[model samples]
Every structure is written in C-alpha cells, then in structure tokens.
Target: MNIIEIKQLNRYFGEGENRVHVLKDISLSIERGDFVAIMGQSGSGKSTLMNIIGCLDTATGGSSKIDGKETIELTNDQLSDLRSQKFGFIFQRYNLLSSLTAAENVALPAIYAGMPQSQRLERAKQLLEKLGLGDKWQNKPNQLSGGQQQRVSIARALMNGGEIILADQPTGALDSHSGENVMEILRQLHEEGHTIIMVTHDKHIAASANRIIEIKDGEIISDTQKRQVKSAVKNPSVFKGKDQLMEAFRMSVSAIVAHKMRSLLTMLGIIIGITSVVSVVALGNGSQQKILENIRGIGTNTMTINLKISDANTLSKQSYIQSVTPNTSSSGILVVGANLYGIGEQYFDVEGLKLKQGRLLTEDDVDQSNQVVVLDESAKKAIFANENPLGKTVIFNKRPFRVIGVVSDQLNLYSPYSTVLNKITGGSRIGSITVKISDDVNSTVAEKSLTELLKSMNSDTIKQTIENTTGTMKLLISSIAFISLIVGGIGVMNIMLVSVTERTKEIGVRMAIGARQINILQQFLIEAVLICLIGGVAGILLSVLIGVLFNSFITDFSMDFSTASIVTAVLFSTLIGVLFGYMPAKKAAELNPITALAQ
Candidate 1:
C-alpha cells in the first residue's frame, strides 16, 4: 500500500492582498520502502511539499494522506502520533541540543514514545554503536564534528523504529567526504526497508535516489522513475502510556542548567516575592503578639471608671465585674519620689500586680486608718535602691509612713484609701473606680457593658480599656507585601516568554521528532515550575534569616514564622509559576515546524 499520497494539495501563506501561494496542484504517491528525491532550486516549493508528506505541516485545500488517514482532517495530537510512528526527520542543520550528551539526544524521540528510561538509553547506545560512534555517546553536541553530530541525529531519528525517513538537504553543511558517508548511511537504511524521501537542490545528491521529481515555481515539472516501488506491511505506534513527565523534567533541568544565569535571573522574582510575603507576615504576627503581651502585662481585663461612690456600688453589682476598688492619687514632696496613690484592699488583685515582698493591705487597713504604704518597683529602685524597704519608715508631708510591701512595675506608692482620705484629703469623694472583668466575659463585651452601665448612672462618666491597635499595622503590611508578590509573578512571566523565544528552533526539532504539542507544553511548564519551587525554598530560607536577625536585634518582639505561612508562601509561588508560565509554554507548543526550523 502507498504509505503517503497527496492529491491536488495547495499551501498558502498570509491572506488578502498579501496572499502568496507556495505549493499548488501537487499529486504524488510513495509506496512503502520507496526512495524518492524532490529536487528544486531556491524559492521552489520542494521543502514545503516534503513538510506536508512528513506530517510537519498541513495542506490548505486538498487531501494529503499518510497511511490512509487524511492529514488535514486529523487532530494535532493524532498527526503527532502518526509522525512519531511512521516518519523520522533529518535536517541539514543536524539540530542536536547542546546541553544534552549524544546518547541523551538520540533517545529524545523514544521519550515522546513513552519508552522506559532503561530501554530508550539502551537502544540509543546501540544505535550510536551501530553508527560507529560507540565511544562518543557521553560527548555533547559541541564536542562532536559536523559529521558526528549528523550521525547522532540519525540515531535519534531511528530510536522509535523510523519506517519512513525524510531528509532535507542532509549533507548540505558537511564536506564532500562526510556528505558521501551520509548518503551511504541513507542507502543502507533504504535497503533495510525504510522508505526514504529527500529534498535537495544539488543534482548530484538527487542522483543517489531511485526516483527523482523536479519542481519549479510551486509546480512539479518532471517525474523520472528508475525503479518500481516495493510495498511492505507496517505496524502502528505500539508505545503507550503518557509517562514522559520524568523525561520532560530531565530535559527541562538540562536546559535550565545550560543557561544558568538566565535561570537564576528568572528565579529572582519568585524568591523576592516569597521572601517579602513571608517576612511581612511574620513581622505583623510578631509585633501584634508582643503588643498584646505588653497590654496584658498592664492588666488586660481591668477598666478604670471615673465615677462617684454610688456608681462604684452599681458597677460592683454587675455579674461580669470580677472585682471593684476605689482609688485616689496625690503627689507631694517625699525623699526621691513625687507621686503616691491610696487604693482599696482589692486594688492589687484588680490591677493584676505581683507582690515582690511582705504582705498586702487588708480590708481592715482600708476600714480603719493606717499609715502603712506599698512601694512599686520604680519607687523601690529610686528611694531604697536594693535596700530592704519593708518595715522601714519614710517621712512624707512631715508624717512617717512604714513601707509594708513592694509590688512589680511603675513608680507609685500605695496606701489605704481610709488613711489617705482621713489624714490627707479629709473628704468623702473617691477619685476613680477600678474594675476587673470576669475571665469568661470577652473584654470588648465587658467594656461595652461597663460603658452602658456608667452612661445609665451618669451619662458623662469616662471609662477606658485597651484596644487591639496592631491590627491596622498588620493589614497595611499585608497589602504592600501582596503587591510585591504580584510584581514578582509578572517578572516570572517575562523571563519565561523570553525563554520560549530563545528555544523556538529546539521546540520545532522536538515536534519533528514526534513530540505532541502537549509534550512541548509540558516541557516548558515543568521548567517554569521547577524554577519557582527552587526560588520559593530560597525565599523561605531568606525569610528565616531575616527573622533571626530581627529577633536578635529587636528586644521587644520576635518574628513569628508560622508553619502555615511558610507552606502557603511556597504553594503560592508554585501557583505563580503555573499562572505566568502558561502563555509562553502554549506559544512554544504552537510554533510552526517549518518556520521554526528556518529560524
């Protein structure tokens, strides 16, 4: 059966006023195992016709069949499958990837065919050995001669059982001796029952094939046949499974390594993005936690209510009120001190003060007059300075008052309310009522209830409770951090687009070697993702470094690096890779094979 048959095939470029016809009225047939050469000079349609026959390009207006399937009617994936199974391409440029070793380049087609790694590598080595380059399998493309590189490409073509070999000026770039060697290789392949189709401008090169077809101005001028076609049975693509991901991954890594500077530059954006987001979040969390801790240090549940004695009684009757105490303050000349406060017995409990020494004032001290006083940390440091103040007397306003205890924090001196009112003020009015809310009640709810109760008793009463003042700060930091992340994502997109442009010809060669469009897409997408993942890890490390430095230098708060935040940052960077990489990867996969090869 004829392996390829084209009838009334036409191919056009551009449209409207710029429409240019390149191939027209082409009718041809090639039987299995046939050796045919298409000859033409520059600007002729010989290469274009060969591309259609090889399933690299589709005909614009007629039926072009490969193994009885219409090329124009088949999906891109089906056409790719047919090309991989039935045809192998030989280019004049010998398009081997510079990053890959000779064996790896040879095994590319079989990778698309989903062959196991061991089997593909084994077959690649065997093909190289058969082509007389057994020792050169580990060598890269640049290390090989033009002839050696061409042979490696031939090995790649035959990796998945190339039944029909298409050669486009295969020896055009080589010396006369290398050219003759290549023709001999083709002759051997043809004799082994592989059908051969060649396109060349050289008449001497054309003479090597059994049949020659001359074309000029997009039309076949003559067909000279020297031998009758011999038909042979053919098998469809037997290789199955969509298991080429690892191979794609390996190829992507090699490509990335080949351009190390470019890859690192591309990753810079992702690294900055993840680092900014993670560090900003940690800073927010750290500052907020630290601030809350300090606020709680100053009595988180305590509210100071400026009220009359009746208002204090009303507040103490509330169910949410844990404790209530009357308080008054006075400032007078005292040895190394200026301020003093007279408070109820429950003042220490309500304000959450921890006593450092001696006993606290009892209810009896508040009911009856007593001259005993308590010194806070600042007062103890100023007046006594590490000396034992307990049982010691300090004279204030020409009256001796004994220090009974020392409490943590602040500079005030505390005495019983009754003693201060009877001896100093000599009045019945109290300054303020301090209330501690029950632990079960939310602070916000307790504050609201307290305010409402105070308003009911006296609409002008003033009350105060701590607020969560760090929320706005964290929110602002988060907003700016996300903006930076977005900018980084765009940077990823920009680099990936440049990468696709730089590797256009590589993509074409892969497509010609049986890689489907999806295969090409998968290759670049995986590459982009790998760069981002690596950058994300680097970013996390950077953020942790920043955190450590922050914690060490700043004493009040530490950077809070939560596991959830780090995980989210990594996943977010991966998302940026996929989101930004799709356009470039799709662009690469959709490149025209002939146009890309020409590039």
Candidate 2:
C-alpha cells in the first residue's frame, strides 16, 4: 500500500495580482518501504513539498495523504498526531534542541506520544545504539560531531516507530563521508521496511533512492522508480495516546534553558514589577487591618457628642430652669473662683465615666451645696503631683474644693485644638460627652440611628465633611497604587519582548518541528507568567517579613495579606503576562521558519 499520495496539490502565497504559487499540480505516490528522493534547486518548491508531505503545512488546493489519511481534513492537533505516528523528520541543519541530550532528543517523539518515561527511554537507547550513537546518549547536540549528530537525528526519527522517515536535506551539513554514512543508514532503514522520502539537490544522493521525483517551477516534471528491490510490508503501530500540550511544555522549557542567560534576563523585569505590585498590596492590607484593630480596641460602639449652648431666645427661662432640675444641676462657679463652670453630677452618668476612686457626686451634693468635687486624672496631676488627690483640697481659680473622686486618664480628650480653644475662651459651660452603646444592640443599626439623630440636630454637615476628607485620602492612595501596578505591567511587557528576541532561533526550530502555533505561543506566555508568579511570591514574603519587623517596634501596626489583595495580585500578574507577553509570544509563534533559521 502507498504510504503517501499527493493528487494535484497546489500551494499558493499572497493573493490577486501578486499571487505566487509555490506548489503547482504536484502528483506523486510512494509505496511502503520505498526510498524516494526529491531534488530541486533553491526556490524550486522542494521544501514546500516536504512540508506538505510531512504534514507541517496544508496545501492551498488539491489533496495529499499520509498513511492513507487525508491531510486536508485533519485539524492541527490531528495532523500533529499523524506526524508523530507515521513520520519522523530529519532536518538539513540538524535542528536538535540545544538543551536536550542525544537520548532525550531521540525520546522526544515518544514523549509526545505520551509513552511512559521508561518505555520512551528504552526505545531511545535502542535506537541510538542502532544508529551507532550508543555511547553518546548523554551528549547534547553541540557536544557531538556533525556525523554523530546526524546519526542522533536518525535515531530520533525511528523512535516513534513511524512507517516513513522524511529527510529535508538531512546530510547537507556533513562531510562527504558523513553524508554517505547517513545515506547508508537510510538504505538500511528502508531495507528494514521503513518508507523514506529525502529532499536533496545532489545527483549522487538522488541516485541511491529507489525512486526520484524532480520538480521545476513548483510542478513535478518527472517521476522515476527503480524496480530492482523487493521489500516486506510492515504495518507500523499507530500512536493512540499523546499529550501535545505536555510535550510542547517540555519543548518550551528546553528552549528556555538552552538560552539560560537570555531567559534569566528576560524574566528579571517581570519579577521586579510583579514583586512591587504584590508588596504594595500586602502592606496596604496589613496597614488597613492594623487601623481596624486599633479602632476596635478603643471600643467599637463608642459614640461622642459635643455640647454647645442653645440660642438664648429659643430657651424660655422657666423652661430652662425646669430642664436643669436639682438632680441635673451643679454649681457653675464657686463664690471666689474666676468664672469656671462645673459640669452637673448628671454628666457622670450621661458620659459613661467610671470613677476609679471615691464616690460620684449626686443630687444630695447639688442640693446641699457641698464643697466636694470629682477630678479627672489631669486635674489631679496639676494639683497634687504624684500624691493621692482624692479627698484633698485643691484651689481652682481661687476656689477651695475637696476632691471626692479621681477619674482614670481620658486619652481621647487630649485634642490640642480643643484645649487651645478652651484656654482662649476663658471658660465653656459645656464639654464633649462620650457614651458607650450596649454591645447587645447591632452596631450597624445603632450607627444608623445615631446618624439620623445627628442629621435631625443639624450636625450631619460636620460628619459629612469628615467622611469626604477620609474618602478623598483613600481614593488618592488607591490611585497611586493602581498607577504603580500599570507601570509594573509595562515593565513586564518590555522584558517579555526581550525574551522573544533572544529565543527566536529556538522558537523557529520548534515550529519547524511538529509544534503547533498555539503550543509555541502558550509556552512563551507561560514562561512570562511563571516569572511574575515567582516574583509575586517573593514580594509577599518580603512584605510579611517587613510587616513583622515593623510590628516589633511599632505598636498596633503590621503587614496583612487580605484575601482580596491576594486574589487581586494573582489576577493582575496573569493579566500582565497576557497583556505584555502576548505581542512577543505572537511574534515568536508567527515567525516564518525560513527567515528565522536564516537569522
């Protein structure tokens, strides 16, 4: 049975007015075990024919078949699988991956075939031995002689147990003797029932083939078959399982590693950019957590109210007196004091101030005109220094009052501006009041009620102003951080472009092989993303370390990694990879093999 059939195939380039047909009405067939050679000068379409037969390029028109399967109908993946199953390729320049050893190179086809490592390695070793490269299994292509490298390529072609071997000027780079040796191997493989199609310009090489096809102007002009040899028909095994994506990944890694210094340099910028983004997010989250914790520690339900005098005309004298009953009234000034008003005994209960010592002044004290007073910590400190101020007589503005109780320190009341205002005003009849809502009530609901009450009292303007200021600051900080992320993304894109240029040849070689376009694109993109991911992880670690160091010295402050920030970082890094890496990877994948190889 014919291993390959080409029926009036046509391949064209460009369109209308500038159309160039690279392959024109090419018709040919090769039976199993036949060793055929295609000979033509440069630009005579020999390479184009080889590409079509090897399933690397689809015909622009007509039909071609490999192992009786129509080439035109196969999807890219199916074509790849067909190539893996039925054909092994040997390139003129020995396109061996620089990163892989001879044995690994041979085993690559099987790996793509999804064969287990053991079986793949075993077959690779056997094939290498058959090709006389047994001792050089571990040597990379660069480490081998031109002849030995060709031999390794031959071994790779045989690894998948394919029926046909496609050689595109396979011996073009070798010495005469090495070229002859390669031909001998092809002859031997043909005798062993492997169909071979070799493209070359050398007449001597062409003469050795069982058949020869000559082309002119993209059309086959002559086909000759020598009938001296008889060969057995051996049915090659079809590869049933293959993970092209996995193989492509392996190829990508090899390509990257082969150009180690370039790869590292390309990844560096992405790493730095992603790390900066992650670090900022981590620190921001940590700081926010610290703020919330401090607020909670002070008391989540704490509410403050500032007292101010009502308009005099709005309060009737009799009504004001009734409102200031004996229970709520206290001496505004002592007979000998300089006009300093005292808060009523009811202030203690209304303000939720817990006296630490002595008794709270009550209605009895107000009614009897007792010369007793309760003093805050600051008042006691000013009057008695370190001595216990309770029950001690203190002269405040020339008024002698005995302290009944000493309150705990009121840290919240130490506002510099408020203190300055009070000092300048001689004295105020009112002070700020603080109330602690019972924790049993829902905080949100209580907040809403408090907001409504404040609005009713016309204090919403002040609250709204405070909120607007806070919101503006938050927005400003967020905008800066977002801009930093964008800058980082641009950095990543720049580095990825550099990577593509550096690995141009490697990418070309992969595409020249059986690698699909998407495979090449995905490989480069994944490499970019991996760099960003690694950088992000490093940044997170650094942020945590710095957060701990900061927390050690600064109270109630530390780095935090909130879930939202983490998710955002990962999403952003991925976006950076796609955005920045896309152009470079596409450039790499879309590169023409001929142009790339020349470079």
Candidate 3:
C-alpha cells in the first residue's frame, strides 16, 4: 500500500509584487517499505517539499494523503496525532528537549502517546539497547559524540513505531566514519521494512536508497527506483532517531546552565518583587492580629461615661444633700459649698461595682440623710493609705463622713469626677457613671448607645478626639506597603520584557521544531510564572523571619499566615507573570522560524 501520496502540490511565499513561488506543482508517491532519497541544490525547494510531506506546512494547492487520509482536511490536533503516530523526523540540527536525558528523550513521544511511564521506560530501554547505546542511556546529548547523538535522534524517531521516517541531512555534522555508521543503521532499518524518505544534497548519500527523487523549484523532476540493497543484519533493530529528543533535552539544560549569570539575572527581578508582596501581606496580617489581642486584653467590655453638670441652681444643695448625707455638718457644708454635689443610691445599682468592704447603702440612704460613703481603691488610698479605709472617718470640706464601703479596683473610673460623689466626698450626687456590660451584649449596640449619649452631652468632640488618639498608625503603614507592591509589579513587567528579548532565538528555534504558537507561548509564560512563584515562596520565608524578629521586641508585630493573603499573593504573582510576560511571549511565538533559525 502506498504510505504517502502528493499530487500537484504548490507552496508560495510573499504576495503581489513581492510574491515568490518556492514550490510549484510537486507530485510524488511512495509505497510502504520504500527507502527513498530526495536530492536538490540549495533553493531547489527540497526542504519545502519535505516540510509539506512531513505535515509541517500545508500545500497551497494540492491533494496530499498520509496512510490514505487526506492531510488538508485534518484538524490541527489530527495533524499532530498523525505526526506522532505515522511519521518521525530527523533534522540536521537535532531538535531535542534540553531537560531530559537520552533515554528520557526517547520516551517523550510515548508521553504524548499517553503511555504509562513504566511502559515508556521499557520501550526506551529496548530501543537504546538496539541502537548500541545501552551504556549511554543516561547520558545527555551534550555528553555524547556527534555520531552517538545522531544515533539517539534516530532512536527517538523509531520509539512510536512510526511507519515513515523523514530525515533532512541526517549525517551533515558527523565525521566520515560516524556518517557511514549512521547510514548503515538507516540501511538496516530500510531492509527491515521501515519506509524511509530522506532529503540530502550529497550524491553519495542519495545512492544508498532504493529510490531517488529529484526536485527543482518545488516540483519533482524525476523519480526512479533502483535495485534493492540488502543489509548484512536482516532483522536489526529499526530504532533510529528515537532518542534525539532525550539527548536534546539533556543538552538544553547544559546550554541553559552554561549561561548561569544570565539566568540568575533574569530571575532576580521576579524574586525581589514576589518577596516584597509576600512579606508585606504577612506583616500586615500579623500586626492587625496583635492590635486585636491588645485591645481584647485591655478589656473587651469596659465602658465609661463622663458627665458635665448644668448650673449650680438645678436643686438646692441642702435639699439634695440633706436627703443623702447622714452627718448634720456635711449637709450644712454642702449647702454652703458651691461645687459639692449629692449622689443617690440609684447610682450604685446602675454601675456594676461590688462593695469589697462594709455594706452597700440602702434606698433609705438616699431618702434620708446618710453621710456614709463608698470609696474606690484609689480614693481610699488617697484618704487613708496606712489605716483600714473601711469604716474610717474622713473630713470632706470640714464635714465629717464615714466610709461605709471600699469599692473594687476599677481602671476605667477611679477618679472623683468619674464615679458617684459618695465614692469620693460622701456626698449623694452622681457625677459620671461607668458600667461593665455583659459579654452577651452586642458591641454594636453598646457603641451606638455610647455615641448617642456622648452626643446628647455635647461630648461628641471628646469621643472623636479619643478615637484619633488611640487608633492604629499601622493602617497607613499597611497601605504604603501595598503601594510598594504595585511598584514592584511594574518592575516585574520590565524584567519580563528583557527576558523575552534575551530568549527570542530560543523561542524561534522551538517554533521551527513543530511547536505550535500556544506551545511556545506556554513555555515562556511558565518560565516567568515559575520565577515569580519561586520568588514569592522565598519572600514569604523572609517575611516570616522578619516578623519573628520584630515580634520578639513588639509582641504585637509579627508575620501572620492568612489563607486569603497567601492565595491572593500567589494569584497576584501569576497575574504579574501573565501581565508582564505576555508581550514578550507573544513576540517570541510570532517570530518567523526561518529568520530565527538563520540567527
């Protein structure tokens, strides 16, 4: 059965006044198991014809079929599948992935074939052994001789059990002896029933095949089948050009590594930018949590109120004082004193304070004169520090008052102006009140009530002043850090642009080697993202260190690992990669392969 058929194929370049016809009306057919050589001088269109036959380029006008399937009508994926299954190509410049070893390179097609790793490894080992590379299976292309590398490429070509092998100047770079060895392998493969089509300008090379096809200006001028040549080894392994990719991949790493300074410099910008972002986020989260903890420690439900009384004529001091003060002198002094006020018994009920000593005043204390008073710890200390403050007598404005109780230590309202007047001067007047609300009380409701009360007292100005004094300066600092990230993102963009420029040739080479546009794009994009991601990880670690160091001094300042921040940083870094790396990747992918290869 004919393995390939091409009829009146044509390929053109440029258009209009600059139009150039590279191939015109090419036609050929090769049966299964045929070993054919295509020979032409430079610009004779042999390469173009090979490209068309190999499915690397579509014919402008023609009917070409591979294994009886029409090539023109196939989808891109279908063509890729056909290339993977039906044809294996050998280039003069071995197009190998630089990251994989020789055996691994040989196993690449099987990966595309979706074969299991073990099965692919087995196939690769068998093919390498057949190619006489059993000992060099782990060696990279760079470590192998030119001839050995060519053999690996040959092995790679055969890994998929492909029916047709297309080779372009397969021995161009080898010494005469190595070249002969490679030719002998091809001859052995041909004798073993593999259909081979090779493009070579060398007359001696052309003579090795059973058939010779000559092309000029994209058209086949002549094709003739000669007598079959027999090989000494009849059933030799048909594994030629199968490990080239593995060798290439292995060599690519060396190529990349050799330029370490360039690689490191290229990655530096990404690292710094990623590091800044991660550190800032971590620090911000840690600081916020610390602030919250400090606030909670101060007390979650401590509330205080401050009151300003109206003019002294609201009620006669004697009338209110006589009802609450027990001593006759206190009532007479209160009537005489201008500022002293009386506290009612109801004040104790409102404020959540427990009398630690003596007893709480009864309602009758407010109805009748009761000179007894409750004193908070600070007040008791001021009146009688050495003596037992409970039941002690103190003179307030020359009026004797008995301390009936000593109140608990309270941080919020320990001053004379803050608690009930009885807590200070044994008077019955309430000045300011403070209450500890239950944890069950909604904080929002408390805040609202506090705000309204302050507003009613014309103390909203005070509330604002206090908030301004106590609120965090870290919020502003965090904002600045985030702004720095934006600046870092710009820097990342600039670096990625430079990276693209440096890798132009590499991208072009990949494209020439049957890489689709998206493939080239993805590779570069992945490279950019990988750099940023690595930097981000490093930055996170550094930030953690900084946070730990800072927290040692300021307890509240530390690195916090927030899921949202981490996820956002990763996503943001990826976006930076795409955003900054896009133009460069696009430029790389759209690069003309011919020009790229020329460079």
Candidate 4:
C-alpha cells in the first residue's frame, strides 16, 4: 500500500468570487520508502498540501489517506496520534523552540506522544548523537549554526522512530555550504529505507529527493517516483495528560530565564500591582480589626443615649456647661461666665464624674429657670483660690449665677459641644444632652438592650450612630488603600497581551505538534498566573515587613492581619491573574497553525 495517497484533493479558501482554490484535483501516490520532492513557486499551494499531509491542517476536499487512515474522518486527537506514530516533521527554518536545548527540542514530540520523561530524554539523546549532534545537545537553537539546527530538527523527526519525514523547505534558511550538509543527512536517511517527502523553493534542494513532483496552480504538473519507499514506523506512546502541563511549565520557566530584562520588566508590573493591593489589604485588615476593637472596648454596657438638640433640654434643668469650644457649626449657646459651666441634673454621672465641692444641680432648676452653675476645680482656683464656691456667685455678662457643685476633670467626647450640630436655632435655646442608661443585665446585654430601646423610640436627630460612624470611617480608609489594584491589573493585562503577540510562532509550533486547544490555554494561563503569584507573594512579604515596623513604635496602631487573611490575599492575587490573563491566552489559542508557522 502507498504510504501517502491523495486522490482528487481540493483545498480552497474564501467564498463566492473571492474563493480561491489553493489545491485543485491533486492526485498522488507514494509507495513505501519513496523519496519524493514536491515543489511550487510562491502561492503555488505546495506548502498547503504538505500541511494537509502532515496533519497540521486539513484538506478542504478530496481524500488524503495517511498510512491508510482517511484524513477527513479522523478526530483531532486521532490525527495527532497518526502524526506521532507515522510521520516526523522538519520545517525549513528548523522550527526548534529557540529557548530550549537541542536535546530538549528533539524530545518535544516524544513528550506529546506520552513517553516517560526519562525515556524521552534518552531517546532524544540517542537521536542527536546519531545525527552528529552529541557534542551540541546542550546548545540552544541560536547557539548552533544554521546547518546544526537543521540537523537537530531532522534528528527530532527521527527520535520517534518514524520512517517518513515531511520536510518543508528543509534547507531554505541555510547557507549554501550548510544546506548541503543537511541534505546529506536526508540522503542518508532516505538510503536507510525511509520515505521522505520534501517541499522546497530551491530546485537544488529538491534535487536531493529521488522523485521530483512539480505542481502549479494547485494541480500536479509533473509526477515522478524513483523507487518504492520504506514504510513508516510503529506505535508511539500517546500519553498526553500531565506531560503537556509539565512541558508548558518547563516552557514558561525557560522563557522567563531566556529574556531576563524583558521578563523582569514584565515581572515588575505584577509586583507593583500585587504590592499595592496586598499592602492595602493588609493595612485594611488592621484597620478593620481596630474598628471592631474600638466598638468592643466600650466595655459592652456603654450606650450613647443620643438627645436631640432641638429638644435635648430636660426638666432636669440640665443647663449643661456651654463650651465656647469650637463645634461643627462653630455656633454654640452663649455661656454666662468664663471657665465655670452651667449645670443640669443628669449630665455628669455617665462620665463617672465625682463632686469635689457643693451639691449637684436639681431637676427643678432647669425647668424652673433657676440660675445654677458647676465649676471644675481649676476654675475654683482661678478666682477663689481657697474660698468656698457654693454661694459665691460667678458673674457672666453681668448676671450672677450661683455655683452649685464642682467636679474633677474627665472629658470623653468627640467634640466639646453637642455630639453633632443642632438642627435649628429653636425658639427656646437647646443644649447638649448625653446620658448613660443603667439596667440590671450584663453590660454587653444592657448595651444591646439600650440599642434596641433607642431604635424603638421615636426621636428626630437622635439615632444609634456609633455603628454608622465606624463603618464610614472604615469605608473611607479602605477605599484609599485598595485603589491601586485597578491600575496594576490593567498594567498586567496590557503586558500579557503584548506577550501573546510576541510569542505567536511558539504557540503555532505547539499547536502543530499535537497540542490541543487547552494546551495553548494552559501554557499562556500558567505564564500569567506565575507572574502574578510572584508579585503577590512579594507584595505580601513587603506588607508584613512594614506592618511589623509599624507596631514597634505606635501603641495605638495595629498591623494585626490574620494568617487566613494573608492567605486570602495571595489567593485573590492569583484570581487577579486569571481575570487579566484570559484575553491574551484566548488570542493565543485562537491562532491558526498555518499562519503561526508562517510567522
């Protein structure tokens, strides 16, 4: 049976008037072990036919039978298997992965074919040594001469033990002297009972094959076969699960190492992105911890009983000390005296204030409009250094107000005036009213109970706003901290897109060498994820370092992010990579192998 059989092969592209047939009515048969050379000028469609035969692409019409298996009916996986077991491909430019060693490049097909890693390496070594590259096995593609890389590719073909090599322009990129050296290897392989089909632009390179088949306008213009060709090889291991993943990993690493400057700049983008977000996340957690701590610190029983300014005055004559101290509105009730404060019945005990002097104000005082005042010990010393302040009236604005009591210094208020500004200038002057509620329950339970009671009561300008205050503060702090991530993600995504474009040909080669769609997907995705992980880990480390430094000096500041939160930050960074990497990876996977190979 013919090793390759093509009958009425019709390969066309486009549609309607623009539809151009690349290959038309192509009929050919190559018996086992035949050396056939297929040549055509530019746009002659010879390479198109070679791609169809190698299974890199499919024929549009007609029948192509490779080792008696019909091309059109084969699944992609099956087609890949056939390429592995029956054919070795050698491209003209020696399409070896530039970053890999000669041995590694030769070993690639075997990796896709599911050979054990050790055996694959051994097979690559043996093939290279046989192809006179034993000393150059460790060399990269650029390190070798044009002739040497060509030989490496041929050896790559032979590594799987296939007798048929579909070489397209095998010598096209070589120097004249180097080109002859590569043709000699093909000649030797042909002599060793193997069928070799070569596609070339040069008549001289085409002369190396035993049979010269010339074609033009997609039809065979000349058909010639010199001898019966040797049949191709046996079953190759077709394993393809983790090996592809492993190869992609290896490939990305090599890419990273190969372009140090380029990769570092790319890496820098991720690092800055990760750092901005990770640091913010760490600090945000610290701030969140503080918020909850502050809330819990009020010893559970503490509830701010908010009093409306428009009606804060109680029957308790609660004429509280007006602070000329600045308030949100900067306008406060005019105080009658300096330093001495007006007294209301219920204000001081919530602060746990103690009397140092006379009696506390009475409930009847404010309601009855009696003039009563309280003095801090410092104020008592200010005027009556050693005198009794009880009856000695303090004069403010020429009105004498009697000092009712004196208290110790202890002030815990957000501001000196009302908790917030009063709603309006009321007909009757209103003042600040803050009271503590004491009930028979756990302080925390009492706190919650008070909160419920406050919620249940109907009062305007009076609300349980502690939670609101804390939440808003956190929102403000967190918004600033997390803002840098957006800029960083965009940078990473832009960089990754450029990476896809730069590496297009490599993507094509992988696809041609039996890589499924997911293979391309995995390779690019892993590359992106890897870059992001570097940035993420680095960013977290930097944040932790800064946090420790912060806690060393500031007693009030905490860098107390939990281990789980840190882990979450890292995981979130990886997710960032996925979101940003998808577009570039998709663009990579969607490239056509024919176009990619040409690039």
Best by lDDT: 1
lDDT of each: 0.78, 0.64, 0.61, 0.65
Which 10 consecutive positions of candidate 4 have the poorest summed lDDT? 320-329
Q: Which regions of candidate 3 fall more than 4 Å away from where they truly are?
A: 14-19, 115-135, 227-456, 465-542, 554-564, 574-599
Q: How far is candidate 4 from the true structure (C-alpha RMSD, Å)?
A: 10.2
What TM-score would you give candidate 1 relative to the actual structure? 0.79
lDDT of 2 by residue, 228-318 (tens): 5465665754533336566666666766667777667655655555556656665665666555444334322344443443321121132
Provide backbone clash counts, one per model. Answer: 0, 1, 29, 8
Error of 3 at 517 (Å): 10
Kindly list the per-residue Cα lDDT of model 3 for residues 85-183, writing each as its tens digit.
667777667766555688987877655554567887778887778767888898888888777777778778788777678998887766677667667
Task: Rate residue 206 of model 4 by lDDT.
Answer: 78
Evaluated against the true structure, the overall lDDT of model 2 is 0.64
- Choose 3 or 4, whichever is better by lDDT: 4
Clashing pairs in 2: 286-560
For candidate 2, the TM-score is 0.68
lDDT of 1: 0.78
lDDT (tens digit, per residue) of candidate 4 on 423-521: 222232334334443322234454455455446521211123345556786686567645665677677667766755787788777766666666667
Q: 2 or 3, which is superior by lDDT?
A: 2
